[model samples]
Target: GSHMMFLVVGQGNPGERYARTRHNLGFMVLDRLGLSFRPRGEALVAEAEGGLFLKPLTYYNLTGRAVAPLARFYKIPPERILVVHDEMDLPLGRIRFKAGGSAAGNRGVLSIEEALGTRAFHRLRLGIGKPPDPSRGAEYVLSPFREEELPVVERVLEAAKEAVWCWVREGLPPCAGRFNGLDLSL
Candidate 1:
């Protein structure tokens, strides 16, 4: 019997320059999966342990153009497509999981929802901390983490990877509480 495939998309812009920025948490998490991505459709894709990881190369807001087609081709439903990305609302190092919600100023997530024509998909929100002033959000999200913040960020990434793996192995209900219940304050 064929294994049921699931898609996990880590949302971020494509480029080495953007690699370590807060907005690239999705890509960072995907990288932590320890698998290399190869070009497939508009995404860089990888397969492992019954899951297919995708990092869309269509830039953040255009993510739907990459995801929708591949998802349609694979016959994967929105519920099985997990989108992980940074969330400024939740204080730093905290993580949250949910089925559907507003994009909350995250264009990457908005793109995914628009492409899927539904917000029914799963999401793992990785907190990067809110900026001191709301106006500084753009600069804050694009900036690299400070030297002192590296330790906590590293810990969060590892925990996030574990949470994602737990999601794949056990399904959302079992892993959501364990992952979403965590709160690592800055």
Candidate 2:
């Protein structure tokens, strides 16, 4: 029997400087999965246990370019694709996954949906917490992480990887049942 293969996409712009920052939370999750992306002809590609990883080679708002090609090549339907990215609307130390929903104002997600031509995919809202001032969101999300935020961020990344794997292996309902409301730690 052939099981569905979920292409786990870590949403982040590619680069060294962006690492460890809120905007790179998706990349951070991929990094913890022991994944790395490198040039594959025109695309940057990486693979891990039952997953394909990608760090967006396109600009922040144009992430669709890098994602569309990969999703097309893998024949992964949107429902079998899970995108992990930071969420400023949710507080730090929180994480959640949903089968499908509106973009929740994440620019990267909107772009990915536009390029993919659908919002049928699953999404993991890897929370990064609200900015001190909600109005400062743009700045807060792009800023470097503070040392104090390390512990919580590290936990989220680890759990995000596990949650991703579970979704791939067990399906969305089981994965969410185990992870959505609890704090999973090492």
Give candidate 1's error at residue 75 in angstroms: 1.6
What candidate 1 gets wrong by more than 4 Å, as runs, is 1-4
Q: Write candidate 1's Cα lDDT for 97-134 as tens digits.
A: 88887888788888878888888888889988888898
Encode model 2's per-residue lDDT on 1-186: one tens digit a residue: 133255777777667767756898887787777666787753466765655666666756677777776778778888788888998777777888887788888998898889899888888888777777778987787787778887877788788889877877777888888888966332
What is the Å distance of residue 104 in model 2 from its true position?
Answer: 1.2
Name the runs in model 2 displaced over 4 angstroms: 1-4, 41-43, 49-51, 184-186
The global C-alpha lDDT for each of the candidates, from Candidate 1 onward, is 0.85, 0.77
On TM-score, the leading prediction is 1
* TM-score for each predicted model, relative to the true structure: 0.93, 0.87
Top candidate, metric lDDT: 1
